[PDB]
Symmetry: D2
Subunit: 488 residues, 4 copies
Amino acid sequence: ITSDRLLIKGGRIVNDDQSFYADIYMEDGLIKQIGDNLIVPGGVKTIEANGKMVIPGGIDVHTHYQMPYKGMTTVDDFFQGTKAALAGGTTMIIDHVVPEPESSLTEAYEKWREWADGKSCCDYALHVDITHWNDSVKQEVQNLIKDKGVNSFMVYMAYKDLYQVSNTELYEIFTCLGELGAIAQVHAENGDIIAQEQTRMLEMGITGPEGHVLSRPEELEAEAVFRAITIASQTNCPLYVTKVMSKSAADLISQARKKGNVVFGEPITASLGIDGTHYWSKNWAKAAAFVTSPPLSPDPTTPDYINSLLASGDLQLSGSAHCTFSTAQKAIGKDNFTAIPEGTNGVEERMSVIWDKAVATGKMDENQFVAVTSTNAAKIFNLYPRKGRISVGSDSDLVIWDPDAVKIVSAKNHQSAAEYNIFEGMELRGAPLVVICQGKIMLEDGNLHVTQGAGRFIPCSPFSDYVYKRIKARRKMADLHAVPRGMY
Amino acid sequence: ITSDRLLIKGGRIVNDDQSFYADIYMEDGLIKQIGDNLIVPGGVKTIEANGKMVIPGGIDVHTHYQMPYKGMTTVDDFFQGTKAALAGGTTMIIDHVVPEPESSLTEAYEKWREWADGKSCCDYALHVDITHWNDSVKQEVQNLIKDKGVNSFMVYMAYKDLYQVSNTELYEIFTCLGELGAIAQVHAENGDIIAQEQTRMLEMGITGPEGHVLSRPEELEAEAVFRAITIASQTNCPLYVTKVMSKSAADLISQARKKGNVVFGEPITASLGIDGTHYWSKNWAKAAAFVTSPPLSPDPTTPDYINSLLASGDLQLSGSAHCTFSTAQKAIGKDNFTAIPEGTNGVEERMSVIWDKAVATGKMDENQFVAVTSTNAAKIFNLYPRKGRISVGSDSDLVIWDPDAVKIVSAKNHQSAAEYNIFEGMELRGAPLVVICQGKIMLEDGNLHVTQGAGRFIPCSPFSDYVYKRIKARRKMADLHAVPRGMY
Amino acid sequence: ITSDRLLIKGGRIVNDDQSFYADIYMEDGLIKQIGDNLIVPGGVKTIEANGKMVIPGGIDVHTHYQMPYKGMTTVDDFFQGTKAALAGGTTMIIDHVVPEPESSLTEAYEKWREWADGKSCCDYALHVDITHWNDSVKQEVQNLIKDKGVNSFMVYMAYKDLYQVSNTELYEIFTCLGELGAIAQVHAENGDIIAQEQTRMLEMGITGPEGHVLSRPEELEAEAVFRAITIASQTNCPLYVTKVMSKSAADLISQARKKGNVVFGEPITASLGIDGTHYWSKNWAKAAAFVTSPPLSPDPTTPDYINSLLASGDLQLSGSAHCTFSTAQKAIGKDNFTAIPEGTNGVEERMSVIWDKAVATGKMDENQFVAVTSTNAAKIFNLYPRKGRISVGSDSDLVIWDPDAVKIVSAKNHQSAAEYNIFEGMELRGAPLVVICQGKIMLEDGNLHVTQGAGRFIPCSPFSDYVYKRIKARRKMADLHAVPRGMY
Amino acid sequence: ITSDRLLIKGGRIVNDDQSFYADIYMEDGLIKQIGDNLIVPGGVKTIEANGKMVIPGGIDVHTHYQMPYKGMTTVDDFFQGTKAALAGGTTMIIDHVVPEPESSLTEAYEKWREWADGKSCCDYALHVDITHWNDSVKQEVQNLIKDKGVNSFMVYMAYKDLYQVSNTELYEIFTCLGELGAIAQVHAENGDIIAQEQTRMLEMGITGPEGHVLSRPEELEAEAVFRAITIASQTNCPLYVTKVMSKSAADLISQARKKGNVVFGEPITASLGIDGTHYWSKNWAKAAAFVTSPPLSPDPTTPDYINSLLASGDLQLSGSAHCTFSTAQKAIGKDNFTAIPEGTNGVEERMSVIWDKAVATGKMDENQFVAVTSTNAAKIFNLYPRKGRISVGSDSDLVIWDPDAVKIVSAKNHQSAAEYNIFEGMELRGAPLVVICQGKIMLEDGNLHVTQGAGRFIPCSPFSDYVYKRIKARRKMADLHAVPRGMY
């Protein structure tokens, strides 16, 4: 894409590896020059930073924009949703393609590309959820990775008699995805037990939002996480844990990474920002707004712990799992929490939450902030250094970040079409002043300047080195010597 | 049972709680008097101890005497097997009743009682393996606990398409067994994955004994253990992990007990005594003799670690899982390790192994030795203080133990009908000199004096306090307050 | 001591090992008979229990009755203090003998015996604090253990330039105490750093009670605990950690016990009952009442965690560290928290706190309650089965315990001469109805019937088997083989 | 420094963040251009890589070249030692300046600069060991950081009555070094206890090399590491653990980094390559060659574990602690191991060992290899991207690395003046083919082309962002609110 020549002067550039004062000159969707006191053509827009930070545009790895649900749709679509992202400093999103059981994955890919190409304000990629399994689906997975630029597929361990897969199915699927060089994602909760504990919570007459959290205690996440981690290690396939919510799940990932397992852990704005004490709100609707799987841990020590592990590297990248429904849609679970559609907000609040909860708190510094907001995502999904880096050659997706900025979050002001915001009234430190996506100024002085359909689908190639170099090294060590033995 | 009056003089008595020098006078299968310088009727056999230790007779909680297998039988039956037990200082055994899938559990109970009543040299109890599940089996479990004196039922997580149970089945079964007050046992290995990894190990042309261990690495035990532990905690049902073999499984039990879970861990002589490096023996038959599930960890640090955790209380009781086949029976897996019948020896070596590997090594003292050889078993299966204690009122099952004794283990000398002994050539410190079961001298000067059928079935009542007091306390804390909420 | 014949009928007896319904008949300070439907002489007082629990009388292992401090004394003396103990179900106390630096330990022993013999309502023993170190003190320690019946000596790692001992001194002292067969106790806090952090907290103008907690964060306890544990392992000497307050210290003890170290951990009523959030009270005096070393962790998750580890066996016995000062005495640290005399209440509340916080919460059962309130103390200090057990032969110190009792704690009602109670207003479940010490009824219908000086000093012999059997086994394994080597 | 124009064609460039095929053109000690198919002046030396790896030149952070010892010197001086480094792919070294107790640190700095400037084949920096402490030394530390370009100072916790510092001294020193912005290094072993255990090992007549390891078991490292970590956290000062040898020390660093402490851990070639079983060699001299503090763990699982933690990021950078003495020098401890001079080889073997033990084993990939061999060192000591990166602007220190190379290590072939090599006979995978330092070819076809004195002292500035951004963030959070309180 062609676009205006743009110079940013006097900025503190911040990447995952270092910080240094320098001017940045961008042109035609790329960063052409970086340095001090540059030779710049006249008739070119200039932005004065005054030493404010300049960082790669965020990569939200988990979104559900206009997601299908019971002949219905999430109230944030690819357009309004990407407005929310950009408003919050995020310039790329990876949305989950959810083919219906007994449906084609390729046809769901077609469905999703159409939507996002026409509506997305910013660049994007897609994950494909493997909602069912057979020879025909496997064939589609090979094609999606080869031809359609998808390197990431999620399997559900929850959702009994819907999206759930057996242990044998996980073995086959992790084996296939390891061979083909893709990132095996999991929604890691034990569906078999949750299904029972839902029926138990209803039998005790607990039909409100608190029934949701109490039906899925973090014990059932940890088990799922542990079983996934285990099967993935036996197939020598890299594992990506989606939406990490509990302290026990995060410790199992930490435990496994120390051993040497190729396991990644994605916390989301919700678990990084707030706990699940609002499931017990007197206001049904407010509590219904927090209903997502896995749930916000009622253990209020969890947010701060999750931020600690994200800082230590035991978790590597942040997402939002942005999946917003209106109160009217939540309401179809008025008298039964299992019918409440699942999902909350977070896409706009993501980067400011991490800065407030991790950076301002001294847990991590601006560089690691970049790693966990953009760069590591980019390395895992094979978008580096194209994304998540302010270097020459790299796309011109970047944010002027003010660490001294302080903004209160409210549903009045957010870009989401949700009536509620789970971070309602939270004073957060640090926010974007300016956002540049595709080299164009899409945020300045509090004003969005987006264009519908502007975003381009970025294809992601298999065998990201960050992920697959060790896996390849181990593949070529599994020569099992049988014992030389005279017969009996 | 009536039996001779017997006095033991000048002995160092050793229970789980203390040691003290005192004379013991027994009569009619009971201990009548304990003390210094006793008033004893003349014409009464006297045994001089010279200060050698006197301990409760061991309780082996895991045996498979004359176990059915493919229209066949283990070469140690209830008679010869209990000779082996007594030879090794063990005076009670709990054997596993294995009803065939789609068979009656009650009819298997009948089958097993007949065999043991007629052949057992010593007292015994029974576990009943829940090899399949439905309304009719549940009804049988209620009856077995109420009428037949069985308080312990095992479920298999391994053995795909044979004994395996789903997660939903484990929830129902742990719920039932918690309500009825029984001990939920598990063979904790992941069958779904092992089944695949067996097919993989055969595809690599590894058909010998090393194929067995490599098909079931300890990762697959840990997962099964963790999933059991988790489901058991959600049903508030006490968990008993059978045949603990790996360091990772033992740590998960230790991890869970510290949190407050009611979880018990049973190592066996095999894992306490030796590692799985002999799976790679050039001699097929010798390696085929070690084939048992879960396997001996090839990690040679495992024996010593298992003994450390048994000493610390993180494991509570020892077993043997005595399940011996002849080489000729093992041989039907000549060309395919999955057809090798599974099981090894250990019943005779149990107590001497623990003394050598734990007591002589300074890890645990004689008192904790008693706890992990008899008393804790007795407390868990509700046989305390009837068994596992030298006090007045208690059955007269006891051993004169020599800690300075040193004996080499060999197949030449063992009471087993196995050609091989997995502890062949092991010099062990500590062994029994005299054994008294039912008040009768069944071992002295290296000579067994047993009687076939002498043993009596001991019924075990549900709701052992050691296990169920906390479980009962928690049952009456699960009142879940629904939120008071005006309608929308 | 002679005393009335006393029968207790229809009680549920509860020891550390079992529970069973039986009558108890006591005479002349001992338990003569236990059983059903006993042959009892007429003209003998009878107590009807109606199935209420009967437990061994508590052993508080940590008290500072009328402790010297700057030409002053704690407001609870040996008489009023032991009234408080008995009021709370505790029938034995072990008080800390604190000889002044450069003073004789034997002369401090003489001082303390005089006081306690003349004032104690109940039986008692003594620890002796090793407040300084040299050849002459070592000689006194040998004599105290041989002649004076003291098997327990504490060293301070805190209190710089007062009671503090170097690492080299701890090596010598743990070596001596291991050889002589005594229990090495530690006040485990790092004095060197605390001393600095006190000066730092004053420089920030923080002179109130919150200065105390903030000057000694639990990091400094953990380090001291870890260093002690380490030195103790190198000298093969058993370690007893006094007054465990933090989660990190308790984990280090748990970590060490699993490895096989002989290490014991004593939580106190304060850390089992409440947290240190009341250090920030607006009311100076109330916050000054909580000032004790190590401090109550401000981390409010700590009480519940401490109770969990006490239940799991990772901590073994409870104390109170009863060391009460009046507000007027606390006040000498009005303008400087380092001058506040250290210590709080707990002796009366000890057993009820554990029942409320651990037993009623389902964490531990009545049997483990007995272990951690009396029996394990008795085993460690070599008072078993004399104390901490309702068996024939054992002293008649026992309590009728009502688990359904519910009492509110207040300074209005306590037996302490303290104006404040750190558990003020706490509704606790479970309390004593009747208490029998030395076979006499010292509590009934809310009324104390004590006698000053009644208590007898119980001598404690070295080399308790519970502690020293493993240590002895290891002593006789440290034969270090030098390598046979031809010269160069 | 001016130097030939040099082009490297057809290479696989490998940095810590990515790998990519590109040509590299160097000139005058810098990398001028990187890219495909470059515009290059004629009359310029060209090196064909054939796709072999190109990596930043290693940074050995721990060397003791011609170190003083008892009026003596290590047999590898700054010249021959840097030959060894370069032979092994290492192009920068940081040597330890060891001022004598009661000596000037500045004068030791002068001494060391003279030596290294005149002899070093490659670039270098210096650490300064704080061997004693007072007002005058502190003043020198301020000056060294401000004027002399030193940002790293080591303190000894071992070496009683020589280099040892109290806990109070560590508090002052970590406080000073935190304020001034320097890296607090520690030799973390407990000297007080080791001193005793040496005297104990001699009293048992164990005077050979095995006496050394047995006098300093890893328990005494862990404690020192833990105490350092703790004091460093209380002073908010970054900690760098030198020469990590044991599994327990590495776990304490891992434990602390997860919590959020600024703690770094430096393993050395010795602990990464081999264990301490050769302390028991019959050949005195061979065992005497392994004598270094802390010692090689006799636990043979240690090498592989250390490599695992280096891979996981729980350790960050490698060193060698190159400190070679001749057998004749070792021999002065013939009859007493405490007189054996301490230190072994490793500088030449460093990078090949890590590749063999970590990369070829699948534990870490080529990128993380770069991080732990050069880049992370460069980030911690503030030499990034000047060093440890093949980018434009960066010094031209780089190695052509062959991962398929296989070389046997021997004393016959090494560049060291040591008669022995602790890795004698070890077949290692991966080695350098070509080495370029300062843009000059210093290794090709097995031939060194060095120049004495060529190396330049690189000054290291305080407050490396990698280290100090979080520390600065926390400094400005320690505002401790005193409670507003009306007086009493």
